[PDB]
């Protein structure tokens, strides 16, 4: 009499337990720890995400205006993901997000979003959707042993 919606599990055939997992989601690292419902994805796609996430724009630190580093991308209006993870809490994601909750439609429209491409609302882009800052700093000196 189990919920026909939950995932199936194997009944406990042991009364010898010596330990218990604090929580299975801790088998993940910082990156995968940010994927929503990873247990519903094909294995390889979780890997791709853990890589791409490192190419996202957010707010790497709150003191960016003071650091003079080579390159930096600060997302204008960072949003906290509507769909989070319990691990996210310790990853400080809701505090320093890297994305926006866009209203997403899954449709064939004019056909200008085929083969892994996407149509974006221009009007939204005007109100600041996905705008970002981009800093680049140069360095130079003077003489050497001359």
């Amino acid at each position: 009499d189990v919920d026909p919606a939950k995932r199936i599990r194997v009944s406990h055939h042991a009364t010898t337990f010596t330990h218990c997992e604090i929580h299975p989601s801790m088998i993940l690292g910082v990156a995968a720890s940010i994927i929503p419902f990873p247990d519903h994805n094909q294995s390889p796609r979780n890997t791709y995400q853990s890589a791409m996430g490192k190419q996202a724009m957010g707010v790497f630190l709150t003191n960016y205006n003071v650091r003079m580093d080579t390159m930096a991308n600060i997302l204008y209006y960072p949003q906290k993901p509507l769909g989070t993870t319990r691990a996210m809490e310790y990853l400080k994601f809701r505090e320093l997000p890297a994305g926006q909750n866009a209203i997403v439609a899954i449709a064939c429209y004019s056909g200008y979003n085929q083969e892994d491409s996407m149509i974006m609302n221009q009007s939204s882009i005007d109100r600041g959707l996905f705008r970002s800052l981009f800093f680049r700093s140069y360095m130079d000196q003077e003489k050497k042993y001359g």
Binding site: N63, Y76, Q79, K80, N101, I103, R127, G128, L129
Partner: protein
């Protein structure tokens, strides 16, 4: 950084309700959902706009230079 002036999707002015949302939470001890609804924000596009914002300027303001 700060409350976007308009909602990205429809443009409905939303950048004039941040402080109200905050009070509706602390002072009136209302829940997020019940709060956004009392601010006239009914369509999920506008709701997300405020509910998902991250007021990083507060921490920015905490610097001296």
């Amino acid at each position: 950084m700060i409350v976007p002036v308009r909602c990205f999707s429809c443009g409905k002015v939303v950048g004039d309700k941040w402080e109200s949302y905050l009070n509706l939470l602390q002072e009136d001890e209302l829940d997020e959902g019940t709060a956004l609804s009392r601010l006239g924000l009914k369509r999920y596009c506008c709701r997300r706009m405020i509910l998902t914002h991250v007021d990083l300027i507060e921490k920015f303001l905490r610097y001296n230079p």
